[PDB]
Design a protein around this ligand. Structure first.
Ligand SMILES: *[C@@H]1O[C@H](CO)[C@@H](O)[C@H](O)[C@H]1NC(C)=O
Lengths: 46, 95
């Protein structure tokens, strides 16, 4: 958003079975850093 | 094809040692500035404070609010900067 690419992380002990239950947990910004480039495509590796 | 400095080590042909800091102001969001004087905070008397760029006047009375690490500053209802995180100490001061 507005040049600043903002990075958010959240680690939880959910271990399958539930299949994405009610995710009332918040999402804090781990870092908010100025990259400054538009994004419209990605791919998540594994 | 180029040239070469004729640097003879002996009187008016002494060059100078140069570093140039060229500036730009329209390429991206700002990423470089200068240091700002970290003047000591003052408690219990009305002062002219400027914290994290937020400007105002008030009494920076001691407080122990549980600000989360990413919470640069704080506010209250009605969009009022009731609290603020004073840096260099991660301490919370009630405005
Ligand atoms: C920055 O934080 C450290 C924490 O140990 C503190 O000692 C220092 O006074 C603070 N400010 C400066 C002047 O760097």
């Amino acid at each position: 958003i507005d040049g600043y690419f903002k990075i958010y992380s959240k680690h939880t002990p959910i271990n399958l079975v539930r299949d994405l239950p009610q995710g009332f947990s918040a999402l804090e910004p781990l870092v908010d850093l100025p990259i400054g480039i538009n994004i419209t495509r990605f791919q998540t590796l594994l | 094809p180029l040239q070469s400095y004729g640097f003879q080590p002996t009187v008016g042909y002494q060059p100078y040692r140069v570093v140039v800091l060229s500036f730009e102001l329209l390429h991206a969001p700002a990423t470089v500035c200068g240091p700002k004087k970290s003047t000591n905070l003052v408690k219990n008397k009305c002062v002219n404070f400027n914290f994290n760029g937020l400007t105002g006047t008030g009494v920076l009375t001691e407080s122990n609010k549980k600000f989360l690490p990413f919470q640069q500053f704080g506010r209250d209802i009605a969009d009022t900067t009731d609290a603020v995180r004073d840096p260099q100490t991660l301490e919370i001061l009630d405005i």
